[PDB]
Amino acid sequence: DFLVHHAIALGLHTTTLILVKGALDARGSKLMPDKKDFGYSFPCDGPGRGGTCDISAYDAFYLAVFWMLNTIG
Amino acid sequence: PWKQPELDPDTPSPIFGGSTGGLLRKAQVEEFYVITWESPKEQIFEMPTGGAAIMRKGPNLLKFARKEQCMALTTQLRSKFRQTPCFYRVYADGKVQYLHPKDGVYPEKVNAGRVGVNQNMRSIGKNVDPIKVVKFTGSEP
Amino acid sequence: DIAGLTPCSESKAYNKLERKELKVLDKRLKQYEPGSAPYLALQATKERTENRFKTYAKQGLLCGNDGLPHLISDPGLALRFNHAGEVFIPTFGFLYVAGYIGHVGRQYIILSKEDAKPTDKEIILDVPLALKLAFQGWAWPLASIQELRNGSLLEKDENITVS
Amino acid sequence: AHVVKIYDTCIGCTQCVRACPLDVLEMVPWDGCKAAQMASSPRTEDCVGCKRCETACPTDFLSVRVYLGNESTRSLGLAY
Amino acid sequence: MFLISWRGYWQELIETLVWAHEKTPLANLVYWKDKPVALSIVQARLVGLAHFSVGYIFTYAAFLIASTAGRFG
Amino acid sequence: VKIAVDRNPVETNFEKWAKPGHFSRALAKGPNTTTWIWNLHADAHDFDNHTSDLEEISRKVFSAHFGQLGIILIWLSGMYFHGARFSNYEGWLSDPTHIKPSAQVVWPIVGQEILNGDVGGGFQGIQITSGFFQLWRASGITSELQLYSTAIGGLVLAAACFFAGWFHYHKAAPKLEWFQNVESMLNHHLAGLLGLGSLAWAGHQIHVSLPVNKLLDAGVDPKEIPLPHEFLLNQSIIADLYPSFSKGLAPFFTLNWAEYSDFLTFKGGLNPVTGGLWLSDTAHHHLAIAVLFLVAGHQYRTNWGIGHSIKDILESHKGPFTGNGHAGLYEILTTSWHAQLAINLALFGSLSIIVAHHMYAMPPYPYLATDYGTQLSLFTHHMWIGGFCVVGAGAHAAIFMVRDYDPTNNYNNLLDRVIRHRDAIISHLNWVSIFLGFHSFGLYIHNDTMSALGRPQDMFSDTAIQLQPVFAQWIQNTHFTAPQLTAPNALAATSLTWGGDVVAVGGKVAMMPIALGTSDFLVHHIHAFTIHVTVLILLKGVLFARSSRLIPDKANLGFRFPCDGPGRGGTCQVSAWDHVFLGLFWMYNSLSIVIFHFSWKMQSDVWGTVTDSGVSHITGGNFAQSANTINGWLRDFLWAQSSQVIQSYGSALSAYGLMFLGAHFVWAFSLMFLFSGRGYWQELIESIVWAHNKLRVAPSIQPRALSITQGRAVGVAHYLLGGIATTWSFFLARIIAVG
Amino acid sequence: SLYTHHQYIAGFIMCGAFAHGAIFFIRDYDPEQNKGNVLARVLDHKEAIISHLSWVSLFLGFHTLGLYVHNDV
Amino acid sequence: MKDFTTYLSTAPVVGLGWAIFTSGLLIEINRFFPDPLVFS
Ligand code: CLA
Ligand code: CLA
Ligand code: CLA
Ligand code: CLA
Ligand code: CLA
Ligand code: CLA
Ligand SMILES: CCCCCCCCCCCCCCCC(=O)OC[C@H](COP(=O)(O)OC[C@@H](O)CO)OC(=O)CCCCCCCCCCCCCCC
Ligand SMILES: CC1=C(C/C=C(\C)CCC[C@H](C)CCC[C@H](C)CCCC(C)C)C(=O)c2ccccc2C1=O
Ligand SMILES: CC1=C(C/C=C(\C)CCC[C@H](C)CCC[C@H](C)CCCC(C)C)C(=O)c2ccccc2C1=O
Structure with missing residues (x-):
């Protein structure tokens, strides 16, 4: 029972990381200083600057659900 | 330019057997694009849709369904063969519009x-x- | 004892697990001849297994109802009931080694950045310098508190922010 | 029906104009820079949203931004 | 599918079916009212997450109820 | 035609070893980001991108290929060596049926000695499944001393191959003219390599392997065997075995070849003792094969004014419907390496697939059919190698269309006309995949739904609405009744899979007739579904690599690029590289079921222990009834046969139990890369760089998230590795612990 | 079923709080009004929060898996 | 030789020597002193 309660802690702390990041970095990132002008949900800013796939805060929520399901599992 | 060149809809086309990347029902109904240029000799060039075709000495004319298909060809001719193409937009009503060298000078040069x-x-x-601007449109404008 | 756990010496399942694991080898040992190398290999494994069980019992470990040894983590109960070597002491054995790796890599980074072309020094290391720092890091806790009390450990708002 | 806005930091490189296939962008004179040039976006109705323009701008942060929006036949790149 | 395979493979494929629907002798008489295009980028992340999560749930619900009901303990 | 070489082109020194990235102009500057590291190991062997010169690209290629041979030869010598010193070959040779092979004994540190299982023969080690022991017995090898010498030869030849790669690049490298002499390659590589190489092996078969295996099969002890050189020197010894040797090459030159009927035979079938092909038949095979390739090598023109020219052949086979046909291909194939690599990999991968089928039904080596783990491991191996090689053709053909395609040479050509009706190809091929996936896989769902509803009479099965493969059944009988009529001199048929009686060896069946029914109909049609689809993904990428309606200029973007942009609704995974990245997932889904087909079919209907009353198969013949339902594949194949893997803890098969789990981790681990994107990760690193910056411990090489195409590649790699390694553990543990 | 039903819902709901909390920063957040307060002081040093979180996820992840794998072997 | 020593100073070569050291050290510390769990 010890190892699982700690493995559960892995889920909550990293699931929070994905969602907290998508919130605080919602207004802007160094890769995209103005996310606020675009919106909550947009696909990307293009292949420039090395690639900008899955930056928006919607894409953070999108990735957390995989961890939500893993954690609850 | 000095004056917009009006369209000559009857000019010889390149020697091209045909393909499946041609025009669809959208062209007759909504709009289509045509490109003109003048070559000094008979050469071979890659088409955007399909394979290779043979130009003709003198004026040449093509018909495309997209503006990108036309400008993709200008970049090939301006670079490889160093020519000066000009293309239009034709609606279903017969109206014609002269698009790309709208000032006669290409956009990458000031005027x-x-x-x-x-x-x-x-x-x-x-x-x-x-x-x-929460309740109307636009933060950038 | 503590937490309703028996010592491993007094447990029955602990000795049951020993008699089982030896019975597997004795059955496996019957196939081969006495003086052959497979016989010598299995006898050594038998010798190691007999040594593993007695040493864990001698060390005052705690075995549960399943018969396997359990570890205790609170230093209070560990020190009170003489179970410190399990978790509490190895905690300091690691952190000495881990900070060794940080104090070394931190110094190689700072010193190469004081010269021209530090990018080349990362892909093509200065091995004489790396060995020098690697043998000078035996007393990294002294240098850390020296660098903290001095104030040259941390940078002060000369770092990039995003907004 | 996309939006293209160019900002005060343009330096007249012309790399945005050379990159756009659909001829959305052109150069206009201006007094703000050394090159005495500035871009423009007269015909965004033909814009498609490739963001090759943003890829070419060498500024610290872009003098050109394509703000995506409502779609259309020309914007979706539909031959049909 | 929606998670791994992304849009550009499919829109080129739908362009090929469109060609066939127009060149076929009798089917060409029928014509769509709204033009067919592939699903957007953000839509696919949503759709694929729904097909993902629903199988994550319908699978475990059957196992949870069947394992416990058959043994009755 | 002549030899042409350029002396001392390149100096040999370690100067460029210190300067990584010298081959590329961009990388020679140096690193300012960590992306420079990934691009280094990636663009290392892309010689076409380094330089435009075709000559230098040819020198580099011809010398790198020498490296793979040296890499192979030390690997091959390792097996011979590890088989000599750390194995039980001499014990297995005297009792093959009861003793199992082993050549990888393990050292005694933490645990790890239990893996040295009780193999048998006064020896304990890992049980191998590579079939070397049966290979070394097919040739005359009785002692370990022969294996040592064979290993020392490989190291000697391998260093020569490495030496040549230095010599034929750094010192004396050929010219482009020497490479374009294509007609001489086929002449030398057919006659010399395939012709004489097969003729030579017949020499080893005739003079060494036949007598040795004749005595071994007659119960003689290996140590009492005369050494193979004695058969050469003494014409009297081998004459006692095969009396035809007493005549001594007079039958050959007088053209009375019937005298050699003793050891040149057309028996067919299998040996009753070893459960393998008659060694006399193979010496006849490789002998006739040599005469066939020798004449083939005297076809072309090279220098003496006789023979064919490939150019005149190609530009003479023309047609009306094709127009100009096959004309500009000799200029293509003599100029681009990628074109040849596409053709060759396609037929080098489809060949290993042919090897996999034609060995299991026709076991060439002795005591292979009775080693079910070996027979199952060679099939699975040489099939996967075929899938990868075939997929490489779709990748290494698209590179030709992007880089080495000149429209001037191709006007109204075959290649040009294919592109001009490409939309008809992909459209007509799209309909087939939908037709098959409905009428093939939908049949499985129909059987599942009918069974759950309590209507088993309405399923597709033998006791039911039977769909029997009449065509294959007719071909089985035709090849079975061939010795009577179509091949009178044949004593028996090619294999027993067509029809006949059982061949038992050591109480185990080597091969017995395979019956085809309703289930075999569905599976053989499921394979075509996965194949016609895997072609759709690759063929679409090839034709639409150079241009499409969505993106009329892809060739300027290149072979591998992630996307043009979010516009047009989205242009992600539009390149030809991303088509290959998708085709690998379908190759995996295809061969994974070709492999499950081989395991359950052969366990249930073929393999098993023969008793007085018939044969007792491993799974009791459940392929006919259970396979029609998908739940059957889940119950009777996966849940059932996984008992040996799961219960492997505490035994010699414990390594397979761990690999079974670790293969799942690496599979799921790939999902982070496929599902996610570069954007989230590059921002996360910024918040991490802050802490590394706060403590004045930060890298001068800036950390950057992986490129888009790399995240896709990293996914499919960890994906396929975890998916394939699971079978590798699920199979060997299941089959080594027989049943 | 009553346990899994509520817990799977507890995860879905809780992933919405952060998501709908991220939309606030884009649409309904005014920095000049909320200047110097707790909400701006959190958003100022977000690089510390996201970093110290990543330590806990990595720490639990390595050491928990390493023990299970140590026991598997 | 100056360039050879420089090649040996690259990242992967130095990492190889590190790995043989740390791995061989841990193994030989488990070859002798077998099965440590509690530290005396
Ligand atoms: C010691 C002798 C020697 C020396 C000093 C050189 C020196 C040089 N060679 Mg040469 N070469 C040699 C032997 C040598 N070569 C041999 C034996 C061959 C035949 C294979 C070649 C074939 C060859 C070619 C074809 C080329 C060179 C090139 C070069 C130059 C660049 C070297 C470089 O990038 O380093 C690279 C340093 C290395 C250490 C490379 C190691 C590669 C090994 C073989 C891989 C090992 C496989 C691994 C174990 C598998 C496990 C991995 C797993 C994931 C599967 C340089 C002048 C290149 C050139 O002309 O410069 C533009 C070039 O194109 N050489
Ligand atoms: C089994 C699959 C799997 C695994 C192992 C991980 C693992 C991880 N994910 Mg992840 N993820 C997955 C599936 C998985 N994910 C899926 C399907 C999704 C949905 C797209 C995501 C979405 C996701 C997001 C959105 C985020 C993560 C994050 C993380 C990290 C959490 C920190 C942690 O505990 O690291 C330690 C735990 C480990 C298990 C470490 C793996 C390495 C072990 C020790 C093996 C070491 C290698 C060994 C020496 C052999 C190497 C040899 C080889 C190179 C040849 C971690 C690397 C978060 C992150 O990176 O923040 C820090 C994060 O933000 N993941
Ligand atoms: C009878 C003559 C002969 C023979 C036997 C070969 C044999 C071979 N050639 Mg080849 N070739 C020939 C004539 C011949 N060639 C001619 C005339 C030309 C020019 C027209 C070429 C041009 C050529 C190219 C361009 C390439 C080959 C390659 C190969 C190898 C393919 C590897 C393989 O399939 O695994 C079979 C492997 C073996 C059987 C192992 C044996 C290896 C030994 C060292 C080879 C011994 C034969 C050798 C050619 C004899 C002369 C060498 C001597 C002068 C020192 C194979 C060894 C490829 C290569 O070099 O890969 C490394 C390659 O890329 N050939
Ligand atoms: C005769 C075989 C052959 C040859 C000579 C080449 C040669 C080439 N290919 Mg090609 N290819 C082949 C077969 C071949 N390929 C096959 C069978 C496929 C299908 C899978 C492909 C698919 C393919 C693609 C998709 C691409 C290439 C590319 C390239 C070029 C760059 C090489 C490169 O980046 O590697 C340098 C070396 C590496 C990158 C290291 C590879 C590491 C692999 C992925 C890991 C192996 C894992 C290991 C086996 C198991 C795990 C254990 C691990 C812990 C060690 C080069 C011209 C690329 C290119 O740009 O072409 C112009 C490209 O994009 N090829
Ligand atoms: C189990 C998962 C799954 C399934 C079912 C499919 C299904 C399909 N994929 Mg696919 N794919 C998947 C995973 C899956 N994919 C993944 C994970 C990847 C990533 C590598 C891909 C990548 C991929 C590519 C790259 C391509 C496909 C293609 C296809 C299609 C092939 C045409 C065909 O046979 O359809 C026929 C229909 C079926 C197979 C459905 C089976 C179930 C039954 C028959 C449906 C029953 C309907 C029911 C009676 C009606 C109920 C109505 C109700 C509302 C009342 C098909 C739609 C190809 C495609 O679309 O082009 C042709 C293609 O090119 N897939
Ligand atoms: C022979 C085949 C081969 C293989 C398998 C590799 C593999 C690798 N090279 Mg590489 N390389 C090769 C040939 C090869 N190279 C050649 C011929 C050259 C030209 C001289 C180079 C030049 C080169 C440079 C210049 C660099 C690499 C780096 C790397 C590593 C990538 C960084 C990484 O993921 O770690 C990331 C690592 C960390 C984030 C932290 C450090 C911890 C590491 C993992 C411990 C050390 C690992 C050790 C080297 C593993 C043993 C070797 C292994 C292949 C068996 C990777 C291990 C990079 C590197 O730093 O290597 C370590 C690097 O900068 N390579
Ligand atoms: C494996 C079985 C697959 C069969 C079903 C596949 C149908 C899909 C192909 C349709 C393309 C049709 C347009 C043709 C393209 C075409 O117009 O080319 C024209 C070509 C005739 O060419 P000409 O003689 O004009 O010129 C040839 C010269 O150009 C030489 O280069 O037609 C054929 O070769 C007929 C091919 C029939 C192809 C169907 C058979 C292919 C499989 C071969 C085995 C068949 C017999 C099997 C029974 C044992
Ligand atoms: C298959 C596929 C398509 C194409 C898929 C299409 C066009 C299927 C959608 C249309 C069909 C006809 C709907 C099928 C009906 C559904 C089963 C039920 C829908 C119910 C809703 C009405 C509620 C994409 O557009 C795409 C985009 C981005 C990433 C991945 C993909 C992707 O994988
Ligand atoms: C995780 C992830 C990253 C981040 C991944 C990174 C930065 C790679 C990390 C590589 C590490 C540095 C390799 C070394 C790992 C271990 C340290 C090796 C073990 C060494 C010890 C034994 C010493 C991306 O950049 C990305 C980009 C696009 C799509 C998906 C993804 C994606 O999923």
């Missing part, structure tokens, strides 16, 4: 006649937050 459009006099960033 005194042009007037600026969509020019913000500020730095990127440095603009109001969305809350200020």
